[PDB]
Amino acid sequence: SFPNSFRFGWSQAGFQSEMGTPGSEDPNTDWYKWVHDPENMAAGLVSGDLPENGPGYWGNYKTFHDNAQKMGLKIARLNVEWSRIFPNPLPDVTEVEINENELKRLDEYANKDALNHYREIFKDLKSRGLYFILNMYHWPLPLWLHDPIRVRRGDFTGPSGWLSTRTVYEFARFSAYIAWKFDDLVDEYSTMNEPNVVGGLGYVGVKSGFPPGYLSFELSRRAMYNIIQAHARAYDGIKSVSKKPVGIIYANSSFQPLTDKDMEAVEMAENDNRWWFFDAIIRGEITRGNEKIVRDDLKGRLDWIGVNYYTRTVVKRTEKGYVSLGGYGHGCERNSVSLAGLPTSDFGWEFFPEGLYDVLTKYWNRYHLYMYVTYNGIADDADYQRPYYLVSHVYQVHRAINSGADVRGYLHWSLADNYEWASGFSMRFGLLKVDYNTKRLYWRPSALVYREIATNGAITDEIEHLNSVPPVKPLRH
Amino acid sequence: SFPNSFRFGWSQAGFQSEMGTPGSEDPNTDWYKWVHDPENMAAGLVSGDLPENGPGYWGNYKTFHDNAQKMGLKIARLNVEWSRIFPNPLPRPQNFDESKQDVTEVEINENELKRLDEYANKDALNHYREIFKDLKSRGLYFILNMYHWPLPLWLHDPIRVRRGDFTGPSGWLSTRTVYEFARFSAYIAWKFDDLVDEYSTMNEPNVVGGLGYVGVKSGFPPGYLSFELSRRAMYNIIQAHARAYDGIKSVSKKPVGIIYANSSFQPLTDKDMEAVEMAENDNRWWFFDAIIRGEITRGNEKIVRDDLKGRLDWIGVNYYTRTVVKRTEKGYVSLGGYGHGCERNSVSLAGLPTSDFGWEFFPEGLYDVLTKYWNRYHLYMYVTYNGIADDADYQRPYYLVSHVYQVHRAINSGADVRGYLHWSLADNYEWASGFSMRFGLLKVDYNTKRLYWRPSALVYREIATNGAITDEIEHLNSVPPVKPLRH
Amino acid sequence: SFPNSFRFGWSQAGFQSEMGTPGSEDPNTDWYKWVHDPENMAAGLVSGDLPENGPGYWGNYKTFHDNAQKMGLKIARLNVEWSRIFPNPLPDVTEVEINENELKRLDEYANKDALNHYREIFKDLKSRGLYFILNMYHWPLPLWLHDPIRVRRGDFTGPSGWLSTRTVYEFARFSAYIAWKFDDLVDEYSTMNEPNVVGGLGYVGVKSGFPPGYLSFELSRRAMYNIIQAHARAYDGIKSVSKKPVGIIYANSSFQPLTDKDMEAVEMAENDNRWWFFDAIIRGEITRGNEKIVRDDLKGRLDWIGVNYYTRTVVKRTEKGYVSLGGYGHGCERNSVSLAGLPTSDFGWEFFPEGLYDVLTKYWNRYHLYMYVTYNGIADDADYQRPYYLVSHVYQVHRAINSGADVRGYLHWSLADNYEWASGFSMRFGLLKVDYNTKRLYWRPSALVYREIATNGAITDEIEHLNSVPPVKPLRH
Amino acid sequence: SFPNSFRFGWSQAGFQSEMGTPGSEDPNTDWYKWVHDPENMAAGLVSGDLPENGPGYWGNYKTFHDNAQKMGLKIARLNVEWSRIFPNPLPRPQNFDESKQDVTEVEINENELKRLDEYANKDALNHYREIFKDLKSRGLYFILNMYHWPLPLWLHDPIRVRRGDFTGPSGWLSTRTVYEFARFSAYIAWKFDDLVDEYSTMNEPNVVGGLGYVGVKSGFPPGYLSFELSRRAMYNIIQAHARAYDGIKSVSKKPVGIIYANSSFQPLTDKDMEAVEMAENDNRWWFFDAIIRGEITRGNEKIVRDDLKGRLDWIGVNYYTRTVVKRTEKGYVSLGGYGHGCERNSVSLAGLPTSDFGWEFFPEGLYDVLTKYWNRYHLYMYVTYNGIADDADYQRPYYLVSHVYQVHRAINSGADVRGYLHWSLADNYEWASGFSMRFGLLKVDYNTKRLYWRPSALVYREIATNGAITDEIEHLNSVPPVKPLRH
Questions:
Q1: What family is this (chains B, D)?
Q2: Which of B143, B401, C263, D46 has most Cβ atoms within 10 angstroms of its Cβ?
Q3: Which runs of E-coded beta strand occur in B204-343?
Q4: Neighbour-count burial for D52-71, b at 16+ CB within 10 Å, e otherwise
């Protein structure tokens, strides 16, 4: 049984779910151009699937919300697509001035049709009694701010995305403008979704097929540097027009030791993948170039933490430092077993709900900021594992709360199937199955399980047995 | 969408589900002695699991019925255990020649029923009444079956027969069992008619005779390998049905049917359609032509017995998989790697997934069996068994919705089908296989006897409360994806 | 490297390999009638395969011997079929009198065609330089001594096989007669093959489909009692016409403890499955009423021990005694992995070569009689595991010799595929693959490996890597 | 049974096998720098394994050749590493315009060769001479290949190109590389003609250009994604072959061929036969029509260059699996789940087993490729590559015998095929995948550098010493049973 004010819901992204219905196409993002690029397709960097054939949330949002209401959900996290509001070009970053006159000038350039359509979507959302977390950014940038093919080719004379402080400046003004327009509907804000993935896969993990796909340690650091300032300036921008909480959403793994001699490798991995980022935007502690400092304009720019989680990462100590191991966590075979004997998803991700308890309690002990679980889900078209995955991870959230961690909601990824970036439509995370020909939504049995949890605010006695590992013997291994 | 009077429910057996609570043990059956036998255990004929450690329906029936009511179910099929009502030997009848091959009449009258009452176990009788009263109070339509395999020990010592000794109580090899079963069936209807909606005489008699005397590796009693004695057992069980039908009708006006195990016989190639008809004759039509039309074979002669004709009001269709056959020169043969004879948790030679029991996914077979019964006899039917051994619940959601869809299809073709009864509500003791084969919509923890809802149970609630496969769950009318399953 | 006199070869059975060529059919055994029985076929007790469609050693023995010679083999163990020599009825057991006149009377009833044919086979065998171990009995009995269908049905008024002392009496005379006729060709004798399997599967493990398939603890004990005396009387019978060594061949498992608290269960299992039998025929010791009584007519009736081995048996202690565990050893799934992570064969038998060292050294320490490994092989049509199985077990024999055990040969089961009893032809144990349509023999790669071992008398450097477990990841799980 | 002069042997590469003993390291190649690059390692473009920990052929070549002789092999194809002979930059040529697109002639004469000799590493040169002398002393026919992917660092800095900087040494994007490769090839033939039987200019140039500039997830250098630069690289590599052919012929009269990577293009359905023809044009025929008939497209439109025509004496056919294609409206597409793109240690969508690399078992394709090359050009062939990644040796015995059988079938059809060279004699460094992909008939222990005979090596000895697939091993001409394998 969960606290009275705890809410169960779902998370969703604009680029992944909006398109699919007539009139919904948004061609003005780096991601849109990226997945249509002939060379990216021939290299197998992208799947060949196109987002304009997606589930059609732009047109069918009422049907989405009907199903969420029947499922007993009480909270939703969505984002607005920057490119839809500002499709056309507009004429250290320690401050970005925000004032009424600047906002009114921005208003003259905004696409009012897209603005009003979002208002209709969000009004319908609130009319179902759903608590609303509005996220400003979930990866695609306006084309006038980032041509990713040019950067992929090694040409840095054009719009270069997060490599340019121009993007930092415009993002802060975008965030302030959206809050200025939508504060009456919003309950809590998030500046961005998983900035570590944008910088990490965009400039280091280039086999993932994320834009701009230019391999460079140095440019990865610059992108993360600029995105950190962009968060702080967006925080100040939102606070200049709103008094509501402002947080951030971040991708996490539970770092686990291979042997009992690897506990120091775990702490190194947590520093390098987690603590360095949040120490910057909470405590102001960052390193600029080759020097460590404390920036006052970064300190204290966070009210809550969005915890995304889906699997662990196993590490061991080396002489040079630490390394992560294949065959566990993120790097398993699809629809198989890990080296630890645990089942893997359609994406090759290892079943490990204990990791969610680890991540929540560690965030709480270090910063004592309240949290939402803003992402937890599994790629599972057949729905073989998702019932166990759902109940097990919800149980671990209950465990974290009992330990004293202030966790206020669980948001599953996702309500319905959607476009999974470079992997296309074949990775299906939905509680609801999408038929992309008819756009009809279907209830997987795990959706019936989730309705039991959400309507009762607890893991009921009837479904407690699903707090367990999916039996491996009947699965492929 | 199903007819207004169509009912969704479940089927259950006494020996498999009753025991598990203190004082519920029934040690007075051939099956109880059979699964406790040291030699059977050492041979691996039986699993070593014991039914007295089961799900405890005898004591916990209210909890069973609570969950069925929450699930929206509206019909139930159960049986009474003969051994519980009459645990002790009854005296030999005065005028009854046990060397006579045919039992054409068993006299039933008020005084005979009263004499039987003096030997009945009143504790068991009153307890069943309480169980059935609680069942009816939940709005459940009640099909009462008289027999679901175990016989009283005083009528069958199966260890003696296994050893080749036929001088003791020999079960369905003796016409004494035929005589006593007819009187048992009449007695139960005499006692319970106020609670019963429809009757069944017995469950799957073809499995009792077939596995008991031919398929002896299955570990069914008495496990004596003999073609001839298999035929004699089936001959007596046919007369026992006819005499039980007449016995029940002498005290009741309610419908009396029978429950029978079926496969859908399918041709390997398009050249094997005659092998299908042969298999249907030898495994299905011969039995029902006997109890409906009176047409039987006695010894080496084919006849028409007036005392067998017309002894059936409805047909209980049990189904779970197909059987693939091909023509030979000698006749026909059934093929391994399909239907009943697959590897467990794998795929068949046709690429279809198999259950924990090694049974192939083939819902089309249910349409085949229902329509063929209808076209031949035009008697209305209940689907009295459909289920899958699936502890993890990976396949059961697809299995449930796909087969329910095929029932809807059969009704559209004109077949009079009045209910679908899933096997089963909760896990139970699966005969020689023990507790490891789990058929329940509800998972049973045998240590605590607690019941848990598998997701397929939530799916069934959607079906039952809506009386239809809703739009939301139509996608489950499909084959479980084989790629993520074990091959 | 093995001792100079150590010999590599193969073992073979008459019923399994002889038939298949024109004129080779032997219909006069309990086993022949058993596998043709309509009721046994319908119950699935027997496979439906018929031995008269077998590999045809009766007609093609020269081809068998050609391949064995090319493979460098130096020893062979075969048996004569009692039923072939005496197909027709002839008109405590502490003594069976053998004398010249009795043998001459027996000679008048013997089938001379079959006798001369065996002589031609064994002469050709010896002409290849093969050391010859002749076994008298390898399970089928003459029909006039055992009608197994009658016993299966519970009728004990007919010929009842090893339940009747008539079989004991006639077997001793058969054994003496064969040694009388063939001593010039034989190097060493064995009385019988695996009598524990005959009694155990015939009367307890009746799902195995072995004759007569009558489930009875008591009759199982009587069969073993009679078969023990039959060995002793056959030993005395052979020694009355020959001075050559006489041993016995016995089926073994390596009994292994589940946990370190189960070592007493191992000793109990070894007592009940191994030591009770050999203490009887070596030391004369049998137990009668909680006392160790000693029969003089059984003592000292053994010159060597034939060690058959293919897998382990895992046991644990109960309060009542001990029990063996499924998922290990004999009781695994086919073409899978055991609960210990070890691969299993086409028969479901676990890979455990260490067990052969355990069994050899334990026999040696208790009795100090020299041994031959008279059976070691695997059901493996594809030949995926047999190369590892062969080299690993041969290495364990080398280990046993280094420990001091007198082991004088390794005899693989088998040279070529053959009829595997109730399982029929589908279980293929051969170093050579048999095409049962053409009767052609093919060399599996493990046969090429065995030639390297046999011709060099050692596991060469080139193939040492096969002393390892077959990699499990590429195999079926 | 094969023709009297047919030879069984193996193929091998310098970068993959030479290093592993102290002092054998060659750090002066684009490939060496590429696999040591920290950013490539962090991206997972390369495995992290390093070639200097390899099987040690540079020092232990006699042990390799001893085992090959024991195996009955009679032919070997090896290459010299350009970087070992010329580790230092050569001065810019006096009369050569690098902006000119076409290299139609490279002058070779005695005085120019003697000047080149002044820059060559004589120790490395003599060591290769000792390796090849040992090879010939065992009766092995010798095919010398000039190029097997790594370029001298002074001709190609691949990290610079990966970053989008084209102001440095740019490999096959520069005609400087074309000019120097022709002189390298003529120089090597000048030095080794007495030991060589037949020449090859290069190994799989389609993979160098295709994976280097299009298939960049493969981790091949320089990994710069560009259709246009892929075309320029292939254009330059074609001229480099023609100029190398002419360079070798100016000092030798022996045959000069080329080695090329092939797939058998197969139609998904019977409606996809035109997609097969398109795939063969775009991946095979365009290249060989250029270097045999002189037919090429320069920039926009098509021509016939006399300086390219007739520059080939024989064709090296590399093969390991098929590619399944289907018709689209735009053209054709290749399908995952078949051929190159299957799961590792599994089954394809057609039910055929896959290797440690995820490559589908399809020996019939080798017959398809050999006969099609023969019918189009009527130049004799060697099978210069055929093998499987298989550490456990489960599939290689079937793979070996099946593909050898298909070569025999191609010869019976009239194709002039003169040898079969398995990949490879021993395990080696498999480029971006590192050491985990093991192709050897002999297994390598990389700690001790000891070689072990897998059973397939004993099978190959039977084939080679008898010059035929003997009756004893004919059953291996079949698909590995999938049921006992992981699937």
A1: Belongs to the glycosyl hydrolase 1 family.
A2: B143
A3: 256-267, 295-298, 301-304, 314-327, 332-334
A4: bbbbbbbbbbebbbebbeeb
Resolution of this entry, Å: 2.2
Q: Transcribe C81-113 into DSSP letters.
A: -HHHH--S-----------HHHHHHHHHHS-HH
The residues facing D8 across adjacent strands are: D420
Gap between the Cα atoms of B208 and B193, Å rounded? 27
- Taking the C-alpha atoms of residue B355 and residue B361, their distance in angstroms, rounded to an integer, is 8
| Chain centroid offset of residue B25 CA | 22
- Domain covering D1-487 assigned CATH 2.60.40.650 in the classification: no
3-state per-residue secondary structure call for C284-301: CEEECCCCEEECCCCCCC
Query: Does the distance separating the beta carbons of B484 and A346 come in below 8 Å?
Result: yes
- Do strands A292-294 and A432-434 pair parallel, antiparallel, or not at all (unpaired)? unpaired
CB contact under 8 A, D215 and A155: no
State the method. X-ray
d(CA B124, CA A199): 74
Instruction: Confirm or reject contact between A362 and chain B (CB < 8 A).
Output: no
User: Which chains, if any, share at least 3 CB pairs under 8 A with chain C?
Assistant: B, D
Spatial separation of the C-alpha atoms in residues B407 and B421, rounded to whole Å: 11
**Closest CA of chain A from D91, distance in Å:** 30
Strands B7-11 and B417-422 come out as parallel
Cβ contact (<8 Å) for B397 and A445? yes
d(CA D29, CA B351): 51
Q: From CA C168, how far away is CA C226, in angstroms rounded?
A: 6
Query: Which position has the token pair 């929206």?
Result: B72
> Structural domain boundaries of chain A?
1-477
Subunits touching D (CB < 8 Å, at least 3 pairs)? A, C
Indicate yes or no: CB of A433 within 8 angstroms of CB of B475.
Answer: yes
- Asked if the Cβ–Cβ distance from C215 to B162 is below 8 Å, we say yes
State how far the Cα of C371 lies from the Cα of C403, in Å rounded to an integer: 14
Token reading at A205: 């993990």
Torsions phi, psi for D141 (to 5 deg): -65, 140
Phi, psi of C188 (to 5 degrees): -140, 155
Q: Which residue of A has its CA nearest to D43?
A: A205
Of the candidates C440, C445, C470, the beta carbon closest to that of D455 is on: C445
Angle of CA points A214, A220, A221, to nearest 5° = 155
Asked whether the beta carbons of residue A42 and residue D163 sit closer than 8 angstroms, the reply is: no
The DSSP line for B267-295 is: ESSTT-HHHHHHHHIIIIIHHHHHHHH-E
C-alpha dihedral (D230, D235, D237, D240), degrees to nearest 10: -160
Q: Which of these, D209, D206, D205, lies nearest to D223 by C-alpha position?
A: D209
Distance (Å, whole) CA A349 – CA A56: 27
Subunits with 3+ C-beta pairs closer than 8 A to A: B, D
Describe chain B by its helix, strand, coil percentages, rounded to 5: 40, 15, 40
List the CATH code of the domain at C1-477: 3.20.20.80
**B290 burial type by CB count under 10 A (0-12 exposed, 13-18 middle, 19+ buried):** buried
Q: Nearest C-alpha of chain C: how many angstroms from B371?
A: 30
CB atoms B42 and C204 under 8 Å: yes
Tally A–D CB contacts below 8 A.
Answer: 51
For residue C39, which residues of chain B lie inside 8 Å, CB to CB?
214, 225-227
Burial (Cβ within 10 Å: 0-12, 13-18, ≥19) of residue D270: exposed
- In the stretch 385-444 of chain C, residues with CB closer than 8 A to chain D read 387, 433, 435, 440, 442-443
